[PDB]
Symmetry: D2
Subunit: 336 residues, 4 copies
Amino acid sequence: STQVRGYDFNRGVNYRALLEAFGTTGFQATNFGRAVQQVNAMIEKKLEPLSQDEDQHADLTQSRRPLTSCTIFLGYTSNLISSGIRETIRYLVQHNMVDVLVTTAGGVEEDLIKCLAPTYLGEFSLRGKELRENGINRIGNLLVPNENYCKFEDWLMPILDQMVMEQNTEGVKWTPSKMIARLGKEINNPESVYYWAQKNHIPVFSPALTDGSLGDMIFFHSYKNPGLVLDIVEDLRLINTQAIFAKCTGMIILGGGVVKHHIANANLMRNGADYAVYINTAQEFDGSDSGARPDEAVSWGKIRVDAQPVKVYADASLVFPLLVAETFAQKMDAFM
Amino acid sequence: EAPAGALAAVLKHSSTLPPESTQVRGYDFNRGVNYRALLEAFGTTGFQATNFGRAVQQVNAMIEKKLEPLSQDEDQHADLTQSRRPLTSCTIFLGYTSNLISSGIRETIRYLVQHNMVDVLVTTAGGVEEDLIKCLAPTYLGEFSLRGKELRENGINRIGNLLVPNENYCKFEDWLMPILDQMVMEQNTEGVKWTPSKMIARLGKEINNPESVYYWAQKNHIPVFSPALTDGSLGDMIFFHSYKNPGLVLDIVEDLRLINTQAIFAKCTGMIILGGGVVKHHIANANLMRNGADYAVYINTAQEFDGSDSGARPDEAVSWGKIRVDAQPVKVYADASLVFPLLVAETFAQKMDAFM
Amino acid sequence: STQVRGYDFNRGVNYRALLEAFGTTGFQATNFGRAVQQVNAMIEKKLEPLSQDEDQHADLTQSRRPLTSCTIFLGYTSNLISSGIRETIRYLVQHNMVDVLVTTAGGVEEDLIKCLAPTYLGEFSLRGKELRENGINRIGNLLVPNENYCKFEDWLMPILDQMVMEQNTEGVKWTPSKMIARLGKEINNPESVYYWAQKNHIPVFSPALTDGSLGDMIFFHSYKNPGLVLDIVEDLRLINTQAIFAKCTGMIILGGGVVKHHIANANLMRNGADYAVYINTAQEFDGSDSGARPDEAVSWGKIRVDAQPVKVYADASLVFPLLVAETFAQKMDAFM
Amino acid sequence: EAPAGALAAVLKHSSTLPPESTQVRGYDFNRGVNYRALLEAFGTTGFQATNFGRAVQQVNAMIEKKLEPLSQDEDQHADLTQSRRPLTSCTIFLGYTSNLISSGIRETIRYLVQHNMVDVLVTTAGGVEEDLIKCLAPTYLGEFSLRGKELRENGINRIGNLLVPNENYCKFEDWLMPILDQMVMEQNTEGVKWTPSKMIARLGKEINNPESVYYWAQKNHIPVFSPALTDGSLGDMIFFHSYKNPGLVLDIVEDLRLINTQAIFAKCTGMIILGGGVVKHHIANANLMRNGADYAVYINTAQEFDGSDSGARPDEAVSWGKIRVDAQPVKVYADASLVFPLLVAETFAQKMDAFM
């Protein structure tokens, strides 16, 4: 039995000790401590060597990425890529610390656009009428000028031309994940999440990739250069095979919606993830999958019965950099 | 001896409010129980009850607009939208998350589609498949607190305080596999280019059951968009089927052209959005293509403070051009299982005469 | 096992059938149906006669109110008295349908002030600076002109003069509940909750009665007429004795904070309430009592282990009139 | 051939933002782990991380103001406030709900009071008694999902994901009853007029333990207001004791005069409010008596949509005059068990040199 006790600032500001004290502080601070333990378990598993038997089974995929003892799925909503958590995610992907990414369309395009033009701080209360009259789009307390999307249009249209030509003359069958790899290669910029994902052979799934600015541009482009196809069925096979042939899996899911369900549903194909951490502000009472507790996923087989999953009820812009500081960033040497 | 500055601060003088101003007053049960009068009193009760009253007014404005006559060239509209659905004076987009189709709101939505009262549906994969599965086997009441280990050991899946046996999905598999066979055959020998909306139309025709939302949608030529249709049991089944009968392709690009042209060539549009996520964003982004919806009602429990699109207020969408600056959109902060049947009772269900 | 099925509007708009269908609709609609059942159980118990043995024990209080088989505690936060739920609560109190009220200071004073001047509809987004410059106070999407409080001052100060004189020359020992009864008698208006509460011998507890406009006025008054005492200890005995000597109790609690805890803590003195319905929007994850599920109260003994308590996660301005329509209002004849 | 109106709506031109404008950028872990730099980066990360950065700036402004020297007449101030506490250039009110004293935030708050860094405390009954009980017996970690029946059968009470055995309250009873005896004797023969704040000062002196918040508050002459002090275990004990030793009176009127004069005669005030309910409203209402607080930080998880004071944004308090129109208040939407230790680390704990 562990007693409740908070950090005593009479010791001074010892930041590592202060973070470690969240575990015995209670409420969501304790869940944060549990999340640190869960992610550290994923990492310690990932760094354990594969045995001959495990290596054989795990090599049964047609994937370029070297195999590890724990395949980590990282999911995040679009708002987090507009936020500075974009830098946190880029770091993990840059250093091969996660294996599969799932995000929404905005979570793809806003990373690429930040390589062309920045996002700014604003306020939640700013009025839409005056913002619209000035061509400024609001995302929470952030602001994106519409010229950001003008710049995106100029950058993206020549790539769309090439994708259609490769489709029609070289037999390419595009899917969202293949498009995202190509866009990351094109952006060719070390500040971009998707640049590092394609460089490190980390696939990115986004089955509703048309639901944003990328879609806007594909739509306009289709009138002068018709026929681009994005198949979502092949990408479903690809993500499910990453779960089925994993030795162990971990899920780290920031936010709700499709990013959460799609990762969890892939792990149901292996009868459940071994480790799971959720960070989101959704509540269960309306029955939404977004707000469901991890124990709902256990009933489905999306999380194993013997797992000890954790949800932290918090804005990930506060908690996720602290989690990374106490986990992945402490083992950076092992990932290089 | 009371401090003067304190007295000045607490007992500051006021301005008279506009003569327009509406007083707060709740329903008086000394009148007895007239449920119509009770619901009408929500408008002057305050907080989310007042937002409910505003939502009734917004949806009734959508319906009244939709019922105004219009002259328009049938042929050009159909060519520009590649849709057989005739244009009306207000194109209503109805979006809803998967949980609401597991709930009894499935019946509410089915009623609206059955009577051709909305024009476009957007939902997630679960919002498609659980409507079809309910024609094969029921969903049951349970509790939120039921433990996953015991449920999993008994082959029962939890959805909030609802429960679905694994066997429901076995029945779904048996029903769906022959249809997937036909879809692959039609793709490869009859040139069919499948998209989510075209698949959902076919599944509604195949289920052939008037309790199904999607049966009525296809019969009434109401398209259903679901750009991540692979994210659920339908995806599971497409995946398993592809190892027995490879080659099915579902394109999301053509479905993007179809939904966006529904907004672009509308006379007016309204959005009724239950929940958040892709269903909310996809409807609103289509309406950005016409510089914004004319009417909008959101019902959801999401909060803005984490910056999520799901939790954003309607006024965020105004900044983007997804809602017109001149619109008067409404968000009701509530579980739609409570509020949507009441909203329908006071709006669409009152205008049933006009829809026949 | 009960199947999920929603109301079918092909039947037309049969409002009673539509409300009854919430029970099988799921999520919070099902919890609403459960709340209707719980409140109807309280009412059916309340109307059951007392046996000789029960009557003896239950008559052991020094309270004027006739005894019933179920003592119902109704708690509500201040915002609800600013809302039109004030009318709903007034109806229940007018017809002796509940037995004990608990509210905060604002929940007392705003009922009295509405007899002097109305509250108006506004918007949540109205800016505080422009409102303050015009002397308009915001409560959610409601608006109260500051002159409302001017009018309250003129009404209340002569009563405060009399209370101090009765304290100092007639031995009166004031408590919050005794003050609230006196204010209800003074307002002398059938639209007032507290008018009906004192007329029907329904006590009102509010241990932090100084936390609002009443407090403002007592404070200013104390400089010209010092010495008024409001004892909270006697009121603690009074509320606890209502629970201890009840045959059965029910709790109907709208909102959180002191109104919720004070009713629940009184019922712990009898080893728990027999029936309980919570309606509020608070969430459990921060550990707050306001957001705790009913099952937390079971661990304390505030709700009996054999009870079937219900929480509806919703704004009570939507749900509480519907609940009353399906419960108390259907048995109005029995309460007259 | 892309529709022109669509192109015009989606690709609308923009205005240049002020040169002031701050770009979004998160902490770069390629730098390694410098926790101070990591916390500083919250300001430019967005959403509630940005609000945390703003809260750091607001509390540091309170502290910097408090440390400015001031000449003022000791005697008149003391007569007008009936307080021995010397005036500083910024009077800081710290409010917190009961759950936070059951949590480890008890240690955080105790540190601030121990070093005289705040001037007024407001909490609920639980926020008083659980600090005292922790000097007798500990609180334990548990889980939110633990079932009440099994816990009750084992004599364990749940507070969120924390657990307190019944025996803690038995130890509290044994400790408290002799003190209540002395309080009744002092009331009846020495003219003491008890109020919650005076009782809380006495209990802190009696617990005589440097782990206790209230031990330090009374030693440093920091008053604690709790107008519903009877609403908890202290109330239970006062109730039981009154049948053995009748007559204790706790007056809330004099405590209202004491807290309001703390605000009225302040040079400046700041509010730091953790949670909602009475603690939030009581601090803010006291500050209305001076026409508003100069600085304010709220940390809570409550939402505005139900109209509750707990969930109200700071800008609602501006309409009332509880916060000055010229102030720049901040709300962080978060569990304070996560954010308050980080806030203290970046504010009060950095200025420890000045407070000694």
